[PDB]
Every structure is written in C-alpha cells, then in structure tokens.
Design a protein around this ligand. Structure first.
Ligand SMILES: N[C@@H](CCC(=O)N[C@@H](CS)C(=O)NCC(=O)O)C(=O)O
Ligand SMILES: N[C@@H](CCC(=O)N[C@@H](CS)C(=O)NCC(=O)O)C(=O)O
Lengths: 214, 214
C-alpha cells in the first residue's frame, strides 16, 4: 500500500532519510511520535514485529527495518544508488562515516550537563573535518561527483545542525556554503522545505541541552 | 603487493575487521601505532594520500579507505558477503547498527571522568539489547543464518568487551554464550587468537578509564 517511516517528530537521526525520500519522489506515510507520546511508542515498540525494536523504523511490507543507516541505505539501494562495484560502494560508505563523525559528534555532547564546555572542544575540531569536505568538493559538484548520493543529504543535515551551534563555522568554507545552497535548490528539496511536512525544529530530543526545546 | 591495515595497537574500532580478514584467510600487512608514536602517525596522516585522513585506514593499492565500517564492508564486499538484493543487504546493515549500539555505547562512556557512574546506566540497558540478539540466534546458527557475515565478528568483539565491564552480563543469555564459543571454534579464528598477531589488550585507547592501560 505504502511504506511507513516512524520516528520522533524531530530531525535527529532520520532527517537525511526524509530528504532522500522527497528527492526520489518516493511515496511514504509517517508515524510521528510527539514528546508526550512515549507511551504510544512503548505500546507499539513490540507490536510492529520488527527484528530489533527501535526508532527510527521503516516498514515496507517487504521488510521491517530499524537502524537509521540501514534504512537510508536500503531506500537508495532500491534506486540503485550505493555503488556499482566494491570500490565505489566503499567510497560512498567512507563519505557516510565522515559525515557521521560530525553529526554524531554533536549528538554526543548535546544532551550533556557539561555541553556548554564540551561545545568548545567539538567546535575547535570541526574545522579539520569541514576541510576534508571542502577539498573533496573543490573538484566535484556533489560528494560523489556530478550525481547525488545519500551522503549528500547526510552532509546537508550536518551542515544545518552545526550552523546553529556556531553561525560562523562555515565562514572560511565557501564550497560548503555553495553546496548547502545547491542542495536547497534541488526542485524536490526546495518544495519539501517550504511544505507542511518539514520538521524544522528540534534538532535532537526535546530534552537536549542543545537542539532541544521548541 | 599486499593490502595494509593501519591502526593503534589496540582492539578498538578495528578488531572485528582483523577477525574478518583471518576468517577469509586474506593476506595483509599491518601498520601498528604504539601509544608513544602519535608523532609517527601525525607525520603519516597526510602522506598516505587518503581522502579523509583518519585511523583506521586500509590501503589496497586499488583504494585508500578510512572509515572503520567502510573498511570492514569493503573487505566482505570483495568476497560477495553483504547481500544479494536490497532486502538482504538491509538486514545485514541492521545487524551492523544494533551491535554498534552496544560497542559504541561502551566507547561513549569509557574515557569519561564519570565512567564509573555512567557504567551503571549502560549496564542496566545492556540486557534489552542482548535479548534482541539472543532471540535472533534462537532459530539461526549465525546472525544471518547458517553462514557467517561480518556482523558476526562485530558482535563477537562487542561480547568480548562487555564481559570485562561485567563478567556476568552473559549469564541469562546461553545462546549468546554458545555463539561466543562457536566463533572462537572457527579454525581460522582459533588459530588467530592463539597467535602472535592477536592484540588482547587494550580495548580502547590506553588513556580510557575503561579498557585502557596495559
Ligand atoms: N543506532 C540506532 C539508534 C536509535 C536510537 O537511539 N533512537 C532513539 C532516538 S534518536 C529512540 O529514542 N530509541 C527508542 C528506543 O530505544 O525505544 C539508529 O541508528 O537508529
Ligand atoms: N568514525 C571514524 C573514527 C575514527 C577515529 O576516531 N579514530 C581514532 C581512534 S579510535 C583515531 O585516533 N583518529 C585519528 C585522527 O583523527 O587523527 C571511524 O569509524 O573510523
């Protein structure tokens, strides 16, 4: 009938996936759990019949998946995006992980009581990671060349998130600033960001010291 | 000539990969950085010509990879282990991530000043995660059935590590205890664990409050 994507009504681990979906113009319904609906989730966690109960979850009627990275890869795999040979598939997983180093580096410290200080540490390292992507892009339109791949959306999500921790972390990385704008210009993405379905905030769980609240 | 696998002379993010290598009986040399050799690494970090300088790194002469998960997947991809169709490839990435929830859950708290207290929290949740694997195994010899897949080694590494945090976390999970023993009985793995190449300790960086030291 139509695949279902379940997660908290926040950006978190699933935002890049939503972006990929719209880009592919894939049909999908959403199970959005509000901050006061942990009971509704705890009442459904073991009912869906998922192998490893967790959020997010993607039910395809053909499958019952639960790891965010397995879900994003599965979707792209359906559209033959992921590789073509070991070497290319590896290149794409390398991009994946390097963005995760940034995205996860934020999730780690966010939520913590010492966030305000840990922030200093993470931000002092951010430039070295950003640089790797800035160079990559110096001779490629997208992360993997002329064509889009799911890591492009992962990187976009990461960029969106760090700009909130520090509005200036991109000054010094013009290629990254263009890339952020180029992704937003994709007809499908432009349409999505201006739509009712776009979850602009929060970045993390509503409880996080960073990216939380409303 | 022969692929090179570079990393700190510890288990860390690369142990499951070493296990996979031996299992496949793949030829490979190692660049092992000792705790007093950060200079040697900082002097090589930008020389290898890797796209995203980091540890671990896998140089195939055919490729220059750096994300631990991209490296383990690449190796198995060379041996046609990873899938056969989207659905199977997804199932295998789901297993990946679920083990990482355990392995990374340890790395997160290890290294911290509050480790001793965070330990209580992580251990109180460990059972729920362990249970998912115990059930999976109730009707399958390995994680993906009758045949081995790289997540099997990831899970073995995870098991090895938690048994140090709490020697009793496996009491109550007999299938998991057998699985741990079954992996150790693979001719290739048995041979490796008894060899000079096996890095038994440390689990994390020598600095970690947990898994560190000598
Ligand atoms: N490694 C998993 C982690 C998932 C996860 O931690 N999800 C959180 C939200 S970001 C959820 O609250 N877990 C629900 C649960 O464990 O019941 C993934 O990549 O999906
Ligand atoms: N997400 C990366 C992280 C790698 C990483 O953090 N490696 C640590 C050791 S566990 C190393 O010290 N990094 C070396 C560096 O950043 O120069 C991966 O999966 O490989």
């Amino acid at each position: 009938m139509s695949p279902i994507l379940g997660y908290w009504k926040i950006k978190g681990l699933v935002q890049p996936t939503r972006l990929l979906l719209e880009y592919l113009e894939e049909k999908y319904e959403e199970h959005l759990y509000e901050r006061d609906e942990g009971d509704k989730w705890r009442n459904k966690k073991f009912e869906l019949g998922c192998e490893f109960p967790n959020l997010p979850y993607y039910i395809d009627g053909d499958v019952k998946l639960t790891q965010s990275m397995a879900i994003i890869r599965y979707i792209a795999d359906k559209h033959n995006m992921l590789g073509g040979c070991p070497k290319e598939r590896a290149e794409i997983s390398m991009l994946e992980g390097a963005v995760l180093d940034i995205r996860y580096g934020v999730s780690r410290i966010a939520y913590s009581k010492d966030f305000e200080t840990l922030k200093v540490d993470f931000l002092s390292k951010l430039p070295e990671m950003l640089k790797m992507f800035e160079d990559r892009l110096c001779h490629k339109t997208y992360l993997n060349g002329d064509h889009v791949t799911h890591p492009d959306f992962m990187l976009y999500d990461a960029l969106d998130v760090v700009l909130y921790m520090d509005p200036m972390c991109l000054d010094a990385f013009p290629k990254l600033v263009c890339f952020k704008k180029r992704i937003e210009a994709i007809p499908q993405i432009d349409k999505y960001l201006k739509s009712s379905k776009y979850i602009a905030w929060p970045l993390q769980g509503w409880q996080a010291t960073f990216g939380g609240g409303d």
